[PDB]
Design a protein around this nucleic acid. Structure first.
Ligand SMILES: [Mg+2]
Lengths: 110, 174, 126, 69, 52, 108, 100
RNA sequence: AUGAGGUGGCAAGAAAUGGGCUACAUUUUCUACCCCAGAAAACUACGAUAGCCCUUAUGAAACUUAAGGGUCGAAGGUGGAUUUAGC
């Protein structure tokens, strides 16, 4: 059976196809992308079976339309900086103490 | 005047819920449960059901292996601890003839061992508390004298004898 | 009769040599352990070796090309390339089996991303 | 040193939680011994190896069950 | 979806608490990677999100 | 009782559908506790038995039973100064060290 | 089912050292100060000596976690030179590349 | 008795040829300094990563290993044939 990119309209809603971080699926991306060092008198490898395209941490789930749609939805969670504190001069006047603490984001079970 | 804004509180999954509400369903794709590779995409309702059942059977095989040999899956490496990824224990730990053993076996829903321990406690002459008898009758009545997986009520079954044997019967038992 | 009478396909990964790993090939396993300041690199390496051995032993003759092991947070994504020789029902059975077994062995939400190809995708002949 | 510097040092040491009572280099080894976890209690020492009992027995159990080649 | 669309969507419940909020003067996010293209894409994403 | 528990588990099924997309799987894993909760807090799930700073820094309230001005006072002062500078031990383990020293000195 | 008897001894050594670490540390701290009487320091010297030989932290060797090679082990990966090269040359070690 | 113990002894000597190893001093050494200074100078000269003693570090353990101080102030007196390197 054929890949489902054949049914995809040219004016579709791409964020719905890749809602979250997923690996590269050549049957789901309607792009004729090629990757590989082209052979002597040849071409870069096609996408189907291409391990190089599957090793990329692609940003298909984060497109400008997707990012803008997400950030229009996430506005409900934000607050407003106190307008009085216009610059560092007033930040060091009204709130003299400064506490620095750091968080670390690695990848692993712990 | 520094007017500090009021902090907004949200549930731990609120952001994911908003991002999910951003996106609609994909019209060109089978459900998310299946693989988006063409060869593994189901083609028919029967095929989709068969694939789902095969996946669930594999899951159950893995679970059976995990629960059969916890010694290989006990090592914890994830912080914070994940209870839902540790083995489950079905075997009673208390071996002495005592009411606590009966309570544990009722908790584990082991009908046969539960009734056997009740018989042993009676033979020892130990007075089984009314609450534990009520729990035992709850188990027997819900499961109809069979181990957890309709059953037709059989006269003079375990539940019935236990009911007859109780010194005092309250509303809950009836 | 007498002496003077008498007198291999490779995939893109196989074709290229170890001195191209950051030039033409990439890294099959991708994680933060080896970055400066990060810890637990050895634990990740051991996990990777077990993952590769297990996946190759649970999918015998099915894996067309090497695995790609990705890590985001505590997620563990096994992007594998397999063939269309085995039945899809067995593939689903093994997918569920491996996902659950690795999730319970490593205590993390493992996930598996089979990609079937009709046959080995040859790049050269060496 | 001085009277003033000795007293201010011995007071700043009391505020920040350092050794108040005067001591020598050899005796300061106790502070270090109890400030850092001993080498045998570090996780890179007592967990240096993979188990190799679970890893090897599990493969055997998987093969006996016919789920691993 | 051309016709079959969600009629309503359950927006998450964000509550305005009674306690006062924290104020951050500065927030520096240092990202480390083995690839420059990946960090360029991540920088584009993060900058666009901050602007939006 | 068992009846109410099983009835609730039956109520669980009436809205038990397969996952519809990736966000749904992430949400389910977060509720199950498998996924980390963001933004990452490296001290998530660890409260140090609810101790405050003053149980870690001031360990001289456990030296009341030792000699107050001899050389044992000096030694235990060094021990407590070392123990007050451990971020790797809990208050209970520090107290265990101190009490082992107490017992040893009492024996000798 | 460890790699080697040599590794099994180290695993036995590493087990004992962890169990006896607290006892060794406290007893050691008695002898590493010019505060306590020499009478006590000598008593500890006999007591630390009597602790089992395999409990000591010095008798542990950093063997390869896969081949039990005594030497050539990079501590950051706990792997011998030969195993590191095999994995690093196949691109199975993230970030590792041949230098130019 | 290819198993387990015990009692004594066993801790060698000299050339050679093969090759990884310090200085021999005045364009030197010490001090100040970081390049306009003061001294000492071939027998109170230079030099030892040579020997001996003692302290410190690490460790259960230091003649064992390393570092520092003291003691010492040896050969060395510039070494041919050959011969080692280099852009
Ligand atoms: Mg001998």
């Amino acid at each position: 059976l054929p890949p489902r990119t054949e049914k995809m309209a040219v004016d579709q809603d791409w964020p719905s196809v890749y809602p979250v971080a997923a690996p590269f699926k050549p049957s789901a991306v309607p792009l004729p992308v090629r990757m590989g060092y082209p052979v002597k008198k040849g071409v870069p490898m096609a996408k189907e079976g291409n391990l190089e395209l599957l090793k990329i941490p692609n940003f298909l789930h984060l497109t400008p339309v997707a990012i803008k749609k997400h950030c229009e939805a996430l506005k409900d969670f934000c607050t407003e900086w106190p307008a009085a504190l216009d610059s560092d001069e007033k930040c060091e006047k009204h709130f003299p103490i400064e506490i620095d603490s750091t968080d670390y984001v690695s990848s692993g079970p712990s | 005047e520094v007017v500090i804004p009021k902090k907004k509180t949200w549930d731990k999954v609120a952001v994911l819920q908003a991002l999910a509400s951003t996106v609609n369903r994909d019209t060109t794709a089978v459900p998310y449960v299946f693989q988006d590779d063409p060869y593994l995409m189901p083609a028919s309702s029967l095929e989709s059901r068969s694939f789902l059942l095969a996946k669930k059977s594999g899951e159950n095989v893995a679970k059976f292996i995990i629960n059969s040999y916890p010694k290989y899956f006990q090592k914890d490496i994830a912080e914070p601890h994940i209870p839902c990824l540790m083995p489950e224990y079905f075997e009673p730990q208390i071996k002495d003839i005592s009411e606590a053993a009966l309570k544990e076996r009722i908790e584990l829903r082991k009908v046969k061992a539960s009734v056997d321990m009740f018989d042993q406690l009676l033979q020892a002459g130990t007075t089984v508390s009314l609450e534990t008898t009520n729990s035992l009758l709850d188990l027997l009545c819900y499961y109809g004298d069979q181990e957890p997986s309709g059953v037709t009520w059989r006269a003079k079954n375990n539940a019935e004898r236990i009911f007859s044997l109780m010194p005092e019967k309250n509303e809950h038992s009836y | 009769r007498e002496l003077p009478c008498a007198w291999k396909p490779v995939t893109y990964e196989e074709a290229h040599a170890p001195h191209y790993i950051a030039h033409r090939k990439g890294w099959l396993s991708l994680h933060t352990g080896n970055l400066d300041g990060e810890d637990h690199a050895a634990e990740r390496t051991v996990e990777d070796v077990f993952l590769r051995k297990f996946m190759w032993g649970t999918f015998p003759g099915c894996l067309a090309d090497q695995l790609v092991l990705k890590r985001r947070g505590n997620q563990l994504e096994i992007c594998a390339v397999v063939l269309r020789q085995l039945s899809p029902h067995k593939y689903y059975f093994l997918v569920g089996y491996s996902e659950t077994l690795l999730s319970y062995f490593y205590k993390c939400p493992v996930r598996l991303h089979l990609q079937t190809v009709p046959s080995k995708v040859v790049y050269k002949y060496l | 040193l001085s009277e003033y510097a000795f007293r201010m040092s011995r007071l700043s040491a009391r505020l920040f939680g350092e050794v108040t009572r005067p001591t020598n280099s050899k005796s300061m080894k106790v502070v270090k011994l109890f400030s850092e976890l001993p080498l045998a209690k570090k996780k890179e020492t007592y967990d240096w190896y993979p188990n190799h009992h679970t890893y090897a027995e599990l493969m055997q159990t998987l093969r006996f069950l016919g789920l691993y080649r | 979806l051309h016709v079959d669309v969600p009629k309503d969507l359950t927006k998450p419940v964000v509550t305005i608490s009674d306690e006062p909020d924290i104020l951050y003067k500065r927030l520096s996010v240092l990202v480390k990677g083995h690839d420059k293209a990946v960090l360029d894409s991540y920088e584009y994403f993060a900058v666009l999100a901050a602007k939006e | 009782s068992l009846w109410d528990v099983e009835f609730a588990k039956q109520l669980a099924t009436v809205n038990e559908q397969p996952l519809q997309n990736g966000f749904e799987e992430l949400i389910q894993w977060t509720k199950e506790g498998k996924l980390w909760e963001f933004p990452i807090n490296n001290e998530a799930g660890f409260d140090d038995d609810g101790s405050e700073f003053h149980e870690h820094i001031f360990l001289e309230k456990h030296l009341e039973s030792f000699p107050k001005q001899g050389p044992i006072r000096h030694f235990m002062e060094l021990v407590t100064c070392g123990l007050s500078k451990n971020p790797y031990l809990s208050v209970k383990q520090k107290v265990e060290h101190i009490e082992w020293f107490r017992n040893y000195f009492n024996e000798k | 089912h460890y790699v080697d008897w040599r590794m099994w001894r180290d695993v036995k050594r590493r087990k004992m050292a962890y169990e006896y670490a607290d006892e060794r540390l406290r007893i050691n701290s008695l002898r590493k100060n010019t505060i306590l009487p020499k009478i006590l320091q000598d008593v500890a010297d006999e007591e630390i000596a009597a602790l089992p030989r395999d409990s000591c932290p010095v008798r542990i060797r950093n063997r390869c976690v896969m081949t039990s090679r005594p030497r050539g082990v990079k501590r950051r990966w706990r792997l011998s030179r030969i195993v590191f090269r095999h994995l690093a040359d196949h691109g199975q070690l993230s970030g590792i590349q041949r230098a130019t």
